Design a protein around this ligand. Structure first.
Ligand SMILES: Nc1ncnc2c1ncn2[C@@H]1O[C@H](COP(=O)(O)OP(=O)(O)O)[C@@H](O)[C@H]1O
Ligand SMILES: Nc1ncnc2c1ncn2[C@@H]1O[C@H](COP(=O)(O)OP(=O)(O)O)[C@@H](O)[C@H]1O
Ligand SMILES: [Mg+2]
Ligand SMILES: [Mg+2]
Lengths: 360, 360
């Protein structure tokens, strides 16, 4: 009665945040971040993993639209801590503003407003069709505007109090250029925070750079300002800038775009195996089977001393594209799909291995 | 239309197994297992993490009933690979066989047959109210019998084809002793297996010992046979049996039951920091904040050489009880709750630290 209960999905996510967005409790560790005044750096940061995940969900959704429509050119990220607002703007193709014939609602409502809703069910980050709704549910306020020329209409609706309230949809006729814009005020009470502080903002800032880094052919703007990153190699520069090798010489980097789904720089490590890596624009900070795949080859080749001893002098950077990825966790820092399932190959030329001989 | 879709919860779990039970793909690593002929040993094992999780769900549910009713004395685990059947029997209090007034179904149906159903919503392993249903959904066949004297009835129902079919409930009047018995034939096609092989059976076998180890005041029988484990210390013996120290002498173990929720043995390690540990009878093989809590103290004390250097000569075994645990993953190998949230303290006497001086 009171003992034996059944929860709604909504009620349940609220009852079991952990289970959906990750820990809603503080976690302190060394992380790569973009601080305002220093830029890219590795330091002890303290933040709530579940806060990072509602943001990264929305930012990855923009990234995915580029794989959906390659005519997409730009993403604007804006973070206003004092007002507690975050907004993510992309162009290319919007979301059809049309009544969905089966579910009898406008498609943007359906996919931002109801659970288990995705265009990716039947090489995005998106797959499970929670994500947007999770952000919505962990926001005091959550606004969707989208406009799709092909369907001749623009859409705008606002949800409130963790997706429990909602304005009706504002629907107008539209012939402009497509955009989707997601604006949310996360619910800081659920993460036990006053404000978005230096630590979460520097992490969030790092994801916009990551996206410049990860997402081919898309300008990224942070707070109205273009990010000077064009190419994976220039993103990697952010990290290797004023790194020293053993002889007080700055690090050589080796680049090879192996094909459109594998993009790889390599260099020396002087504090053991490290890795920066992305699958479908998602920062796999713990790593994955995609990292293992690649490293294998390299260790494999280099040797021509056990493998593991060489892993300790490598710093690998991978931007890759994988069909239907899986992960250890809800914050996805490690990616668990098998190589025989990735849907593409990484084959690195001799040139790369030979260039690679010639740093430490 | 075809593009923008909404899945049922059922459809979705089937569509996204990974997301619920973990990888449904082979994973190979060194693991602790009970092989038939050697007993407890650490070796490269290959198995499907999602197979282990439907089993461990049911076996943990029995363990939890002991915290629900301490008059529970016994759990029978039976694994029949040739027939593809597994059955888990416990006594103590059954499940009320009564129509649930709100949901208008017998309670056992509701809690084994519908999702987001739990008696733990408002110090079990159970919390999220998926688990049983997940097992049901990854079984070609799944049978529940329960009997609760207080409600004057016994219950029996069978589900089939991943919880898509079901006999009506067999309901009879009952005045005997309470039992709950869960019998399932996992769906091997979803894990891409022919049979349950040596590797999954030795893992499953190890969990029954773990339960003898973890679960105070409950006999455990594997395949009709009592397990000679009474006490945490005797379980620990399984691992330290014919271990050597540095001078070819078998390992000393130090025991302290700090209180009813912390139970701790310690010894030497000669292949670096290791840990065997349980929260609410769940094998946290990766570890957790509960492991960190304890180790802290010990390192802390011992020193009276950096902390980390001592971690490399410890082998810690923890059986603990935690209020409302969280985990990195769906297979729960690491547990993520903060110490200030555990709901109890571990304070170890001087005797323990002083005894602990006197091995390596
Ligand atoms: N920025 C965006 N541009 C276009 N469509 C989007 C965008 N964000 C979300 N969507 C659509 O709404 C759906 C729901 O997003 P989400 O909840 O993340 O599901 P998924 O895990 O499939 O990404 C997506 O599958 C996608 O079709
Ligand atoms: N062996 C058992 N004995 C008694 N009740 C059980 C048993 N197994 C499951 N139940 C009940 O059915 C519910 C559903 O089990 P499960 O799906 O694991 O939910 P939970 O995560 O709460 O354990 C449990 O909350 C518990 O109340
Ligand atoms: Mg998404
Ligand atoms: Mg359970």
């Amino acid at each position: 009665e009171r003992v034996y209960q059944k929860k709604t999905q909504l009620e349940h996510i609220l009852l079991r945040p952990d289970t959906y967005i990750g820990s809603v409790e503080p976690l302190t560790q060394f992380m790569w971040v973009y601080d305002e005044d220093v830029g890219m750096n590795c330091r002890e940061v303290t933040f709530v993993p579940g806060l990072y995940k509602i943001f990264d969900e929305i930012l990855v959704n923009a990234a995915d639209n580029k794989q959906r429509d390659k005519n997409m050119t730009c993403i604007k990220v804006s973070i206003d801590p004092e007002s507690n607002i975050i907004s993510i703007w992309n162009n290319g193709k919007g979301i059809p503003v049309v009544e969905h014939k089966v579910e009898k609602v406008y498609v943007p409502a359906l996919i931002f407003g109801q659970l288990l809703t995705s265009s990716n069910y039947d090489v995005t980050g998106g797959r499970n069709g929670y994500g947007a709704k999770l952000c919505n549910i962990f926001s005091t306020k959550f606004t969707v505007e989208t406009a799709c020329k092909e369907y001749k209409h623009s859409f705008k609706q606002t949800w409130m109090n963790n997706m429990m309230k909602t304005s009706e949809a504002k629907i107008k006729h539209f012939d402009g250029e497509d955009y989707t814009c997601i604006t949310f005020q996360p619910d800081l009470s659920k993460f036990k925070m006053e404000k978005l502080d230096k630590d979460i903002v520097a992490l969030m800032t790092r994801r916009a750079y990551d996206l410049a880094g990860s997402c081919r052919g898309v300008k990224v703007m942070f707070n109205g300002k273009k990010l000077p990153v064009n190419g994976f190699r220039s993103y990697v520069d952010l990290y290797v800038k004023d790194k020293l090798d053993e002889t007080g010489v700055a690090l050589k980097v080796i680049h090879e775009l192996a094909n459109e789904r594998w993009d790889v720089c390599l260099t020396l490590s002087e504090k053991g195996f490290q890795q920066i890596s992305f699958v479908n624009s998602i920062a796999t900070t713990k790593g994955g089977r995609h990292v293992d795949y690649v490293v294998d080859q390299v260790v494999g080749k280099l040797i021509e001393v056990k493998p593991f001893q060489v892993k300790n002098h490598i710093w690998v950077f991978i931007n890759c594209l994988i069909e239907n990825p899986t992960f250890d966790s809800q914050t996805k820092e490690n990616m668990t799909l098998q190589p025989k399932s990735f849907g593409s190959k990484c084959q690195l030329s001799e040139k790369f291995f030979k260039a690679a001989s010639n740093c430490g």
